[PDB]
Design a protein around this ligand. Structure first.
Ligand SMILES: CNc1nc2c(CCNC[C@]34C[C@H]5C[C@H](C[C@H](C5)C3)C4)c3nc(N)[nH]c(=O)c3cc2[nH]1
Ligand SMILES: CNc1nc2c(CCNC[C@]34C[C@H]5C[C@H](C[C@H](C5)C3)C4)c3nc(N)[nH]c(=O)c3cc2[nH]1
Ligand SMILES: [Zn+2]
Ligand SMILES: [Zn+2]
Lengths: 363, 363
């Protein structure tokens, strides 16, 4: 396999389905990437994550640099060996924590004491042995004034160039990993354009839409996606960072997005929320106490083949670890099944009908 | 398979190895039974528990009657269907909580508000669909004066008769399940004898040694086992309740015990203690932070085939669920491997040498 190749096999409107080939495996797109902070997809063994259909998982610079440490993970053989996942890994750069968290910021980077800069972030991702490296950016807070959004975005573009140069200066990283740039600009079309232009001028293997799912709501997110994704190079993958609920994903795919990551299936699962084709349910609710049906009626996952809502209701109410294990496996499988249905419907030219059918039932 | 059959295949001294055949499967003895309070072996799927080699698991009247409720579990199909374990299940009767916990006691039973009595305990075990039912007893506290130990023991024997009669009066239970009586008497030989005599006069399918592992220490426990186990019928299984550390198990087998249950491999695992043939280790200790070896060098479990001490060290320190999953799988597998080595060494007539070798290395 090559270091990186994206090929588009079918289109419907702005939607695309295809594959990313990398040394450690193939990624079917549109793709959902389960996430983790501490070198684990919470409550799942890697083999379980792979069984749900995930092709790639996501890790993060900020948390792994604190614990167990990037240098430590490299001494131990890298992240793949450490956690036992041998397929591609994408790592975020720390740029969302630049917003979400404790800091002193400057053009050099951000101090948290721990420092992150374009160079340090790319170095940490190298030490982890990430397959897809994210540029170090600033997720602009929402709302932002145009002036502030512009200043933030411009800094991110300078950081994007520094990220590219750091990555290219490390031959092993440049020969075996991919680098994605991240578009900023808040909700403003001209800033989004300026950012896309800067990023394509630098040149990346893939392009993320950053700065969304930060409180603007779905309607505004979709409005921004409407003009922002066509600004990105068509022939490279488009990654929407931190999205989202099943209906967010469907709409985003309709607007040209190829890749997604979100804590929702994992986190929500441990809190008792199960995704179903009839919408989400909270398994802790008393109405499930004697319900022998599986979480979802059509789901193919191992949890729905064997255990009832009633049992899982009990496990979550009792604070049992197996409750979190089962809910998480189901929700990740659900998400993977959603992505499969999306890929199949685009390849068959019936995605708009699927999106319609999906929404009528889910809502 | 019959309702219940115990056959002894080999002996060495007081030690025995054999099988218990029941409708839901065969149990190899000496046996270790993983336990749970809430219709789960904590942090493990049933299939994982079975893969470690367990033939039978233990549940408990007291906790399941509180949550999710015995009647509820029966409405849902019984414990086996509910939790997804189709092999035998032994249930304790609530008698240890009579000691360990909130109560008003009388000859009728104990109020906790929830009531337990011989009749109610046996009924709950029926509703759960337990394969091996424990008589409802009182675990005498330690230390106890001879007078108090006797009074307690006598009440337990009256409760044992009531337990037998309740069990026999329910034809489905009597035809498909087994009933074990529990010997009391504290540390006093004459009371232990009186109790064994009472229990054999009633007649049970198996006999438990109750009232130990309640703070007397190993030396005293062994001294009591020395005279107490030969008081029990030789041709029925001998179950030591709530024991124990690997060396407790080896010594108890040397004194004629066939069956064991303990929270240690599960609980200790979630707290960071791993069992190894070189003794227990606390994986949280900094000395393991960069240790690429598995938990144990010889263990056959899936965790030792794939992950390092370093990774599991990280998981436990980070409070990750997968840390508890991995530690628990390993410790239960370890315990099952110990039992296999014990069974093999008795069947080959080299158990005393194994016990010796085991202790030299473990300590
Ligand atoms: C929620 N909406 C949202 N997320 C966003 C992220 C993080 C993506 N998820 C990774 C992450 C973040 C947290 C939570 C988990 C694990 C680990 C820490 C990595 C996912 C973002 N990351 C970067 N670098 N830049 C953004 O603009 C950005 C915008 C986001 N908008
Ligand atoms: C620790 N030493 C010890 N245990 C003992 C138990 C409980 C066995 N384990 C079941 C149990 C108990 C707790 C903890 C887990 C799950 C569930 C609740 C069932 C194991 C005992 N049970 C009964 N009926 N009688 C005893 O004399 C007795 C003595 C014990 N001495
Ligand atoms: Zn499912
Ligand atoms: Zn092991």
């Amino acid at each position: 396999r090559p270091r990186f190749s994206f090929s588009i096999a079918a289109r419907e409107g702005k939607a695309r389905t295809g594959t990313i080939e990398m040394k450690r495996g193939v990624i079917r797109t549109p793709a959902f990437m389960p996430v983790g902070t501490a070198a684990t997809v919470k409550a799942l063994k890697p083999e379980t994550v792979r069984a749900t259909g995930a092709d790639i998982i996501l890790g993060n610079t900020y948390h792994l640099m604190l614990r167990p440490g990037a240098e430590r993970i490299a001494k131990l053989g890298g992240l793949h060996s450490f956690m036992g996942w041998d397929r591609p890994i994408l790592t975020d750069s720390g740029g969302y924590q630049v917003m979400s968290l404790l800091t002193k910021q400057s053009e050099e980077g951000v101090t948290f004491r721990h420092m992150l800069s374009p160079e340090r972030s790319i170095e940490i991702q190298h030490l982890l042995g990430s397959d897809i490296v994210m540029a170090f950016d600033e997720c602009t807070p929402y709302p932002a004034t145009p002036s502030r959004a512009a200043s933030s975005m411009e800094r991110s573009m300078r950081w994007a160039k520094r990220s590219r140069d750091a990555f290219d200066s490390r031959k092993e990283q440049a020969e075996n990993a991919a680098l994605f740039g991240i578009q900023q600009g808040s909700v403003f079309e001209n800033l989004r354009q300026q950012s896309a232009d800067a990023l394509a001028e630098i040149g990346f293997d893939g392009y993320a839409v950053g700065g969304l799912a930060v409180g603007e709501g779905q309607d505004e997110m979709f409005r921004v996606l409407d003009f922002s994704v066509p600004m990105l190079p068509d022939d490279k993958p488009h990654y929407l960072m931190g999205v989202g609920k099943p209906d967010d994903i469907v709409g985003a795919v309709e607007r040209g997005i190829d890749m997604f990551d979100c804590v929702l299936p994992t986190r929500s699962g441990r809190n008792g929320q199960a995704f179903t084709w009839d919408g989400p349910i909270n398994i802790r609710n008393a109405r499930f106490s004697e319900d022998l049906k599986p979480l979802d009626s059509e789901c193919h996952c191992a949890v729905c083949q064997k255990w009832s809502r009633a049992y899982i209701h009990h496990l979550i109410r009792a604070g049992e670890i197996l409750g979190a294990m089962l809910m998480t496996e189901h929700n990740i499988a659900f998400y993977q099944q959603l992505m499969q249905k999306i890929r199949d419907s685009i390849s068959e030219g019936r995605f708009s009908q699927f999106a319609q059918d999906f929404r009528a039932r889910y809502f």
